CSV table of C-alpha atoms in Angstrom, one decimal:
chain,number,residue,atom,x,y,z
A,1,UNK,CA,174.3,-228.3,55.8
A,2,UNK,CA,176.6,-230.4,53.5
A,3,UNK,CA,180.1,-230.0,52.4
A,4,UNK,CA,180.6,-229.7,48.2
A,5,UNK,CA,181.5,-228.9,45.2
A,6,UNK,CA,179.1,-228.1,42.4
A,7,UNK,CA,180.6,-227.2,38.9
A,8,UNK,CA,177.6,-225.7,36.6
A,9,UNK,CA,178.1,-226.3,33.6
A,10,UNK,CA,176.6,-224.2,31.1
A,11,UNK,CA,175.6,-224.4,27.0
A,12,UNK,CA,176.9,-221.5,24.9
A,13,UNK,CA,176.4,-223.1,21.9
A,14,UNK,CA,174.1,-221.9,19.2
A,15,UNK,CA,171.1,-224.3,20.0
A,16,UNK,CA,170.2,-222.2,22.8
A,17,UNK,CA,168.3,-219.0,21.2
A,18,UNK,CA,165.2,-219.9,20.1
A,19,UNK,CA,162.1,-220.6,22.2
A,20,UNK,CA,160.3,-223.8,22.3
A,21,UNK,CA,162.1,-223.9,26.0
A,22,UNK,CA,159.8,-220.8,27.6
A,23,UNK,CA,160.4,-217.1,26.7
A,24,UNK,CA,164.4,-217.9,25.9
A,25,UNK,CA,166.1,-220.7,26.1
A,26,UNK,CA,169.0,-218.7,27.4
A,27,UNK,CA,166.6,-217.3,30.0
A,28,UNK,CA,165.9,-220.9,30.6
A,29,UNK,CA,169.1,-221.8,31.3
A,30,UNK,CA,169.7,-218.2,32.9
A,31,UNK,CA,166.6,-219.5,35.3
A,32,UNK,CA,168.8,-223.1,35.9
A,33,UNK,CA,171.4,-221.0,37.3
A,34,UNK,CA,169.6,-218.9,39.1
A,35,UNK,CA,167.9,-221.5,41.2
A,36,UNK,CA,171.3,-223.4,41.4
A,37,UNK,CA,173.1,-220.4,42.6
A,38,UNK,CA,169.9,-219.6,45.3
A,39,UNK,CA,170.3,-222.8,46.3
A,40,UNK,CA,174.1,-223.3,47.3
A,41,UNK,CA,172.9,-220.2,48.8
A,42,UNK,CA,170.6,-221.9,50.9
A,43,UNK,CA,173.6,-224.6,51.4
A,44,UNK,CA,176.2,-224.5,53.0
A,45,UNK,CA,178.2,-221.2,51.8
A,46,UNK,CA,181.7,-223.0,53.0
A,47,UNK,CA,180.8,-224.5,49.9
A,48,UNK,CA,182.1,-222.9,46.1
A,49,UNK,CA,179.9,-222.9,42.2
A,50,UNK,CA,182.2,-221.7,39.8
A,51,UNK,CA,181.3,-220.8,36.2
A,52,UNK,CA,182.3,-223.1,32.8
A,53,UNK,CA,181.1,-224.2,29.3
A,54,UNK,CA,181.5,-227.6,27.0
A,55,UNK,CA,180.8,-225.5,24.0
A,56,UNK,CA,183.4,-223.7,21.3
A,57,UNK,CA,186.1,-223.1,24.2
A,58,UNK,CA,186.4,-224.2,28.3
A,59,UNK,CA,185.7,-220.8,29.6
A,60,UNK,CA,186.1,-220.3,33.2
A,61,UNK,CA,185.5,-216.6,34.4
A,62,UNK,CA,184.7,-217.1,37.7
A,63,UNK,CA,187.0,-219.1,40.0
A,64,UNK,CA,185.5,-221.7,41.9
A,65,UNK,CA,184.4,-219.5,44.8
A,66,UNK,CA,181.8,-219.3,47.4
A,67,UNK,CA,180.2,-215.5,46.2
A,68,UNK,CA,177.7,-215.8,43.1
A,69,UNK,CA,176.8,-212.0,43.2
A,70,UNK,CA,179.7,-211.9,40.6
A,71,UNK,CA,178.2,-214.6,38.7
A,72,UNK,CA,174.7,-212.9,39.1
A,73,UNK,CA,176.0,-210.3,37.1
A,74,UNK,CA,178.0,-213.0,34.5
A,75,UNK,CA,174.8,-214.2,33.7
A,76,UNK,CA,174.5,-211.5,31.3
A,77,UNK,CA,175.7,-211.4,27.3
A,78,UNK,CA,176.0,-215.2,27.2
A,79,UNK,CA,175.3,-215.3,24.0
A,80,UNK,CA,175.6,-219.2,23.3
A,81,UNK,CA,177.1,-219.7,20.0
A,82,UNK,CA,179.9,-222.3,19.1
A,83,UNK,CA,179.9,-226.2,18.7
A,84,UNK,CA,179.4,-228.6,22.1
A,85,UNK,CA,182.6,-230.8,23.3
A,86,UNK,CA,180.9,-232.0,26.7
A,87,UNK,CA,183.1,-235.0,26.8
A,88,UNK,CA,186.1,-232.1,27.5
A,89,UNK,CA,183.8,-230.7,29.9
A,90,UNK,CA,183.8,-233.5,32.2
A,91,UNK,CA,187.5,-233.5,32.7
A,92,UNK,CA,188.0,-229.6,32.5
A,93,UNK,CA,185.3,-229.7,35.7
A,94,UNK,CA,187.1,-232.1,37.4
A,95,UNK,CA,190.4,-230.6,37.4
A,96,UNK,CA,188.9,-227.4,38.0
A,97,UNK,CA,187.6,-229.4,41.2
A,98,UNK,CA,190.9,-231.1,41.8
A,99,UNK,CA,192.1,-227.3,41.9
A,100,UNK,CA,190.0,-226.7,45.2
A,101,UNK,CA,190.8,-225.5,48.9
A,102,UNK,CA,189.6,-228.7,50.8
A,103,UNK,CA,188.9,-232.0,50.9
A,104,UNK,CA,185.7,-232.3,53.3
A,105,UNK,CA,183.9,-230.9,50.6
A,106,UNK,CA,182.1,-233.3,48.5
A,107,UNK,CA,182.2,-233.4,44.9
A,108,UNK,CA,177.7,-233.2,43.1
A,109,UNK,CA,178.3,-231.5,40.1
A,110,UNK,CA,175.3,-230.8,37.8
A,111,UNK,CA,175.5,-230.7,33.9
A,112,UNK,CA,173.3,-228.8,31.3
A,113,UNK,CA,173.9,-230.3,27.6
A,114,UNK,CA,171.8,-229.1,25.3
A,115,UNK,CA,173.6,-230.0,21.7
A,116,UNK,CA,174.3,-233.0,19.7
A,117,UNK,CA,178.3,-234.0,21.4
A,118,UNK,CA,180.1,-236.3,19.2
A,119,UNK,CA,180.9,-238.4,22.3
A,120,UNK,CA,182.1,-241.6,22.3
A,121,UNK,CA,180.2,-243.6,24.2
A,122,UNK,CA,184.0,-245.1,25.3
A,123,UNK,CA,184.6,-241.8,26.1
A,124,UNK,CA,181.8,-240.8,28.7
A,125,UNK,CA,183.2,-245.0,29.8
A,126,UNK,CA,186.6,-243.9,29.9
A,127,UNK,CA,185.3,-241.0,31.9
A,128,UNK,CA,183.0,-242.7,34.3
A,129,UNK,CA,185.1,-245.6,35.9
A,130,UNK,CA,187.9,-242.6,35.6
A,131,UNK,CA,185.0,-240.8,37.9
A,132,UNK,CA,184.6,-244.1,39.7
A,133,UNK,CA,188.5,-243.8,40.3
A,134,UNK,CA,187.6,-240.3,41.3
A,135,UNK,CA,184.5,-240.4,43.7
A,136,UNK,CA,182.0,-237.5,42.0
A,137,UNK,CA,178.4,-237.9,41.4
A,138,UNK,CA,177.0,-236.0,38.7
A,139,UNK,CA,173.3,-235.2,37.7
A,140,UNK,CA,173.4,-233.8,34.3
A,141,UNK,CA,169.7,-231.9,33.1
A,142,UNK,CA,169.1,-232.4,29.6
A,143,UNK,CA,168.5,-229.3,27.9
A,144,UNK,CA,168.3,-227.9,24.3
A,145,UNK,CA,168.0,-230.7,21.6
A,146,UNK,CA,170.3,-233.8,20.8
A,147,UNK,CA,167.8,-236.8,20.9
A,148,UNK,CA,164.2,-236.8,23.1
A,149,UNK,CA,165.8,-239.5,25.1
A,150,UNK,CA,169.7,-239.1,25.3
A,151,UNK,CA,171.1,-242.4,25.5
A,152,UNK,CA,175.1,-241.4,25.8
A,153,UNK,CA,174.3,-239.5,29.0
A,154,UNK,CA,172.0,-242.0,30.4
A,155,UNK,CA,175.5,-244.5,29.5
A,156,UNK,CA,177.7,-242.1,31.5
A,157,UNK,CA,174.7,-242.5,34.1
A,158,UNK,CA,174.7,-245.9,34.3
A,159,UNK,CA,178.7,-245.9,34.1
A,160,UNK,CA,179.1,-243.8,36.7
A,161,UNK,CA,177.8,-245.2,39.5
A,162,UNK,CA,177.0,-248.9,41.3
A,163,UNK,CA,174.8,-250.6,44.1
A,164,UNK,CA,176.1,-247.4,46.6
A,165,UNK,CA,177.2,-244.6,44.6
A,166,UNK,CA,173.8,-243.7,42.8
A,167,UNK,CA,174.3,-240.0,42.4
A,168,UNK,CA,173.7,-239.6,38.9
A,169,UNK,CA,170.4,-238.5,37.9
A,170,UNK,CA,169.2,-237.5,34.2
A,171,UNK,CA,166.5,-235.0,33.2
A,172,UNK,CA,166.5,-236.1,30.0
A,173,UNK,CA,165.1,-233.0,27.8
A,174,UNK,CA,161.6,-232.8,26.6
A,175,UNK,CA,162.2,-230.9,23.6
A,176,UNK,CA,158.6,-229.5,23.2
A,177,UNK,CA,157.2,-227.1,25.1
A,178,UNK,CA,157.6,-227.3,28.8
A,179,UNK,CA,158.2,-224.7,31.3
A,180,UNK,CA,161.4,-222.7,33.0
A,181,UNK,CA,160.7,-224.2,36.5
A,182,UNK,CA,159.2,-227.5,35.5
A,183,UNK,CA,162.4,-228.6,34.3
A,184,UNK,CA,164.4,-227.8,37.4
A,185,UNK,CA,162.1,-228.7,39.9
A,186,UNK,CA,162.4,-232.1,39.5
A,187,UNK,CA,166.6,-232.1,40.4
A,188,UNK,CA,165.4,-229.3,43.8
A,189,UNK,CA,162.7,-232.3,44.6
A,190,UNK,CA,166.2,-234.9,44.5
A,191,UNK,CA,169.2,-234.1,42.2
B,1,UNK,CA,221.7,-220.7,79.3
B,2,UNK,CA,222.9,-220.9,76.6
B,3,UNK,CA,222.9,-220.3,72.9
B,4,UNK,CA,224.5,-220.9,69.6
B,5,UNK,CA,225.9,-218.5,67.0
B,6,UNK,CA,223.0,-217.5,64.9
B,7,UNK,CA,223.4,-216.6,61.2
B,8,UNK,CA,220.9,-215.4,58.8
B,9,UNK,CA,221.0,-216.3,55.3
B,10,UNK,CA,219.5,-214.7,52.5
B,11,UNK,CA,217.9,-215.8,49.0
B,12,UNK,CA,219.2,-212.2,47.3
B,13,UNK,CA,215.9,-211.3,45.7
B,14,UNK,CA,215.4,-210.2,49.0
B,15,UNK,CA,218.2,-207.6,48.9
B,16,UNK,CA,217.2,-207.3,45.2
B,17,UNK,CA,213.1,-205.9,46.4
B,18,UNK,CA,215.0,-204.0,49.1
B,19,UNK,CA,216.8,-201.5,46.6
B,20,UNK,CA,213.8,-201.5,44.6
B,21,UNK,CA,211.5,-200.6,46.9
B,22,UNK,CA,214.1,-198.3,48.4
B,23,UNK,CA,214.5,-196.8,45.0
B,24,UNK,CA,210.4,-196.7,44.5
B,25,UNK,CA,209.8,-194.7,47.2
B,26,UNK,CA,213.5,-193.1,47.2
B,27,UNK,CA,213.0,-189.8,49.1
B,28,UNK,CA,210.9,-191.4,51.9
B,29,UNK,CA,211.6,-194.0,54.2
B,30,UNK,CA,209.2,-197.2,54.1
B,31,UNK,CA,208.7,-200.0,56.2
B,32,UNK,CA,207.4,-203.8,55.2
B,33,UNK,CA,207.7,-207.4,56.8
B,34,UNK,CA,210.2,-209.5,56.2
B,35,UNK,CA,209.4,-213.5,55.1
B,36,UNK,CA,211.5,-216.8,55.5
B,37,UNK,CA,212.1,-220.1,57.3
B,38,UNK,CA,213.0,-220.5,60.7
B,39,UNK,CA,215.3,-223.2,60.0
B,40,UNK,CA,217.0,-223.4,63.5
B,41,UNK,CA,218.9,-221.9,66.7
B,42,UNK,CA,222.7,-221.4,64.1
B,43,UNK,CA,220.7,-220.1,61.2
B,44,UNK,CA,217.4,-218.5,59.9
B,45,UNK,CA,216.6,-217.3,56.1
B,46,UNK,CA,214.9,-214.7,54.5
B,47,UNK,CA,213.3,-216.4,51.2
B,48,UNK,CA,211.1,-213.6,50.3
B,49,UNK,CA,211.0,-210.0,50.5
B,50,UNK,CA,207.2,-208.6,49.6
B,51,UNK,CA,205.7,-205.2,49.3
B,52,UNK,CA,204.1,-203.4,52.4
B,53,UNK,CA,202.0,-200.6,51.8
B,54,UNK,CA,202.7,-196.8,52.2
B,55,UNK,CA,201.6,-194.7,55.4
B,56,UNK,CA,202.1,-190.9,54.6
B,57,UNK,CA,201.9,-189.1,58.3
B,58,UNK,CA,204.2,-191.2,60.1
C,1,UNK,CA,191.4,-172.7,37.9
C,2,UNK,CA,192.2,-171.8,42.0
C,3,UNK,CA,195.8,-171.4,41.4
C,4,UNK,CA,196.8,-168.1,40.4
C,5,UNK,CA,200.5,-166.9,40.6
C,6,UNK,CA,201.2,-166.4,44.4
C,7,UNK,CA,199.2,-168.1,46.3
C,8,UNK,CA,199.6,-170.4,49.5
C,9,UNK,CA,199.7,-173.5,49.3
C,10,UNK,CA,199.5,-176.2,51.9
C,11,UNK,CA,202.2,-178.8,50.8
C,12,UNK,CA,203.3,-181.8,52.6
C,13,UNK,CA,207.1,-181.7,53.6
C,14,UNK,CA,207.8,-185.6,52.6
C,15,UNK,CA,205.5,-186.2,49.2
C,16,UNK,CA,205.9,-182.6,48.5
C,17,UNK,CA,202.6,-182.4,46.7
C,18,UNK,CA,199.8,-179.9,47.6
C,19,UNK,CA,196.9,-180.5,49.3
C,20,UNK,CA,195.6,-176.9,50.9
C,21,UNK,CA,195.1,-173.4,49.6
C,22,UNK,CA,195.3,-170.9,52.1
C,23,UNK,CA,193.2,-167.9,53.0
C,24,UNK,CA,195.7,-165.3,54.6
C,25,UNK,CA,198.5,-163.8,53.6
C,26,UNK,CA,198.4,-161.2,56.2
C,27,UNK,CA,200.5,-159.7,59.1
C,28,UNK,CA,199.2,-160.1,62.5
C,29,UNK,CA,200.1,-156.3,63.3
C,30,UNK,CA,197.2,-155.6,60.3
C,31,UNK,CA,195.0,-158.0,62.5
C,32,UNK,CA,196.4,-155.8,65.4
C,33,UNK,CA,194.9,-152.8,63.9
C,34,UNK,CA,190.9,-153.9,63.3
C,35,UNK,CA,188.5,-152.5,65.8
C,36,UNK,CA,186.5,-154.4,67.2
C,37,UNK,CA,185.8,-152.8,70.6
C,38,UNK,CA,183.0,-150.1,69.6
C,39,UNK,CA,183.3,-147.2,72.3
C,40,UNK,CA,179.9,-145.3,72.7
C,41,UNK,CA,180.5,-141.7,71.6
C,42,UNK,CA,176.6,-140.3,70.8
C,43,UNK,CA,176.6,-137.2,69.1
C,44,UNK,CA,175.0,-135.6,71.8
C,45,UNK,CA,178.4,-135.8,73.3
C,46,UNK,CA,180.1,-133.2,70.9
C,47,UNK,CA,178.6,-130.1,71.7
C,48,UNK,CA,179.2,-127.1,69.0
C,49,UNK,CA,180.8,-128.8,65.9
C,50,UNK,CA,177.3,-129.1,63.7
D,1,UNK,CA,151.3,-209.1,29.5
D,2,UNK,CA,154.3,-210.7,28.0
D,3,UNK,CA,156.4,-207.6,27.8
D,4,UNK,CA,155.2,-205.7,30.9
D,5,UNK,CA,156.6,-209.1,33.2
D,6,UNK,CA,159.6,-208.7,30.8
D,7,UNK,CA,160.4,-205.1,32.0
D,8,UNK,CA,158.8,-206.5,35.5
D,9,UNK,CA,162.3,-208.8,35.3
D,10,UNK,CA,164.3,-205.8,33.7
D,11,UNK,CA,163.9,-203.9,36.5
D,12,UNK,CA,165.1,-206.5,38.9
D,13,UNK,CA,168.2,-206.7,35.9
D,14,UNK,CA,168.5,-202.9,36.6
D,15,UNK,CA,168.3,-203.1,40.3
D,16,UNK,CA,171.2,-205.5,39.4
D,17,UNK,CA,172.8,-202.7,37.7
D,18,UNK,CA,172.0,-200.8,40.5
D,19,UNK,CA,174.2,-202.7,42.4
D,20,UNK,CA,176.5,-202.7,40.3
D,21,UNK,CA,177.0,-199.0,40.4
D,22,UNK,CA,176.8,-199.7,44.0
D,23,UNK,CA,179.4,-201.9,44.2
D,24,UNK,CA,182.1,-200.0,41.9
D,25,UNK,CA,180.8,-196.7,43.7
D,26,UNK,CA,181.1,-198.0,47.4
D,27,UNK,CA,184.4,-200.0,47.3
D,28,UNK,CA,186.4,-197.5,44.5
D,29,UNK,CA,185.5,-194.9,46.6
D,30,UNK,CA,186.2,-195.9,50.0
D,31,UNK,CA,189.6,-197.0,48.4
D,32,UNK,CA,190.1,-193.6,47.2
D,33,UNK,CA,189.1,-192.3,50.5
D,34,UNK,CA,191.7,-194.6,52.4
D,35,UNK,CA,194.5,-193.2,49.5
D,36,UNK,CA,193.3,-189.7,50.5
D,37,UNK,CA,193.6,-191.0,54.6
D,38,UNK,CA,197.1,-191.7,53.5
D,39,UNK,CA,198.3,-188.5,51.8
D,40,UNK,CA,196.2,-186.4,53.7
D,41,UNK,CA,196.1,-187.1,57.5
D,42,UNK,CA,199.8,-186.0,57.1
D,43,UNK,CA,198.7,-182.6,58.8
D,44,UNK,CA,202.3,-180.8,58.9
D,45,UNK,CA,202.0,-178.7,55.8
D,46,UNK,CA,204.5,-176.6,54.5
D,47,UNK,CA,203.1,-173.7,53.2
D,48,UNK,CA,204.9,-171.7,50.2
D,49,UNK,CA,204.6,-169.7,46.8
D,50,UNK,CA,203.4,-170.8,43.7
């Protein structure tokens, strides 16, 4: 096993609802954390997933803790409505990781964006050599629609990390039609 | 051997919970455990005085 | 609806809150009186009182 | 056979709900039960009049 951290971090803005992205787009991303939550599951559980959003507030309901039964059942009435601030959400994750219980724990966190962010691209900069200040990886999966090949978050990707630290991996979205576990198998093959 | 001439200081909200937990449960008896800083031999404190749960039989 | 006026019930001495109800309210002298022993009198033993 | 694997995944929602009901059944109860351990392993009763 390995020692963690891994912040989802969910869409609930009102992009989400229709269904180009298989039967909902909120079961799609229901599915995301379903298969994230099975497998921290199959990690180590010393380990803690916590609940949050980017869009229309920074709403944690869960703390950071090593159940997801709780969360099981906080998967339902999502309902994503609001406007996306995913350049908050970085920070709101971190200092809900720099309010952990250890410090052997690692520190992956994944990202779901799935919205057009007005995010600087100095921002997401400001952010990433903040993160490389910081020491966390994170492998953001492109969901919803902002562009068919995000750019910003490929910046933050290439920002984030250099020659050692290459955790940051993008499933950009493909905004037709593709499946619920196409999508995520891809980070469960490598992250 | 020998030893030195202990004291035990207080922080008063500890007296403060004991009257009002005294007062809570007021025609029974109650027992808790009591939380501090062992500072040294002369001295020790009571910082904090927190609820303990009821028993009913004895 | 199971406490009508004069009943038993079992009430702790410290909480002084009820948590029984009673079955008895009885002397043990009554309980003294019930037969239980059953003597074997036939009536072929009384002769003459038909 | 859309909407049967939909209620195929509803019933796994509901088993979730059945947990649920399990959950706040179990632990509230056995709480309860503990509170009643409490107040009524106390087994000196007085008895009295109502």
């Amino acid at each position: 096993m390995v020692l963690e951290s891994t912040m989802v971090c969910v869409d609930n803005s009102e992009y989400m609802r229709n269904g180009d992205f298989l039967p909902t787009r909120l079961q799609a991303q229901q599915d995301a954390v379903n298969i994230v939550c099975h497998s921290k599951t199959r990690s180590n559980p010393e380990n803690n997933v916590g609940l949050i959003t980017l869009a229309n507030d920074c709403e944690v309901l869960t703390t950071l803790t090593p159940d997801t039964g709780r969360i099981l059942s906080k998967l339902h009435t999502v309902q994503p409505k609001g406007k996306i601030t995913f350049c908050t959400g970085i920070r709101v994750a971190h200092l809900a990781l720099k309010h952990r219980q250890g410090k052997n724990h690692k520190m992956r966190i994944i990202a779901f964006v799935g919205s057009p962010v007005e995010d600087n691209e100095k921002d997401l900069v400001k952010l990433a050599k903040r993160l490389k200040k910081e020491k966390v990886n994170v492998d953001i999966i492109n969901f919803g629609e902002e562009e068919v090949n995000t750019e910003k978050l490929t910046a933050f990707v290439n920002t984030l990390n250099g020659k050692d630290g290459t955790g940051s991996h993008l499933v950009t979205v493909p905004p037709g039609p593709s499946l619920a576990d196409a999508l995520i198998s891809s980070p469960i093959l490598a992250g | 051997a020998v030893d030195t001439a202990e004291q035990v200081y207080i922080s008063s909200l500890a007296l403060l919970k004991m009257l009002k937990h005294g007062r809570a449960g007021v025609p029974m008896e109650v027992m808790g455990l009591m939380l501090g800083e062992f500072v040294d031999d002369y001295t020790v404190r009571v910082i904090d005085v927190f609820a303990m749960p009821q028993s009913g039989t004895g | 609806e199971k406490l009508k006026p004069g009943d038993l019930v079992g009430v702790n001495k410290d909480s002084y809150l009820i948590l029984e109800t009673l079955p008895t309210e009885y002397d043990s002298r009554v309980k003294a009186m019930e037969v239980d022993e059953r003597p074997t009198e036939q009536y072929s033993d009384i002769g003459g009182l038909d | 056979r859309t909407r049967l694997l939909d209620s195929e995944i509803k019933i796994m929602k509901s088993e979730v709900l059945r947990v649920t009901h399990e959950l706040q059944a179990m632990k509230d109860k056995i709480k309860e039960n503990s509170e009643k351990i409490k107040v009524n392993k106390t087994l000196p009763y007085l008895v009295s009049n109502v």
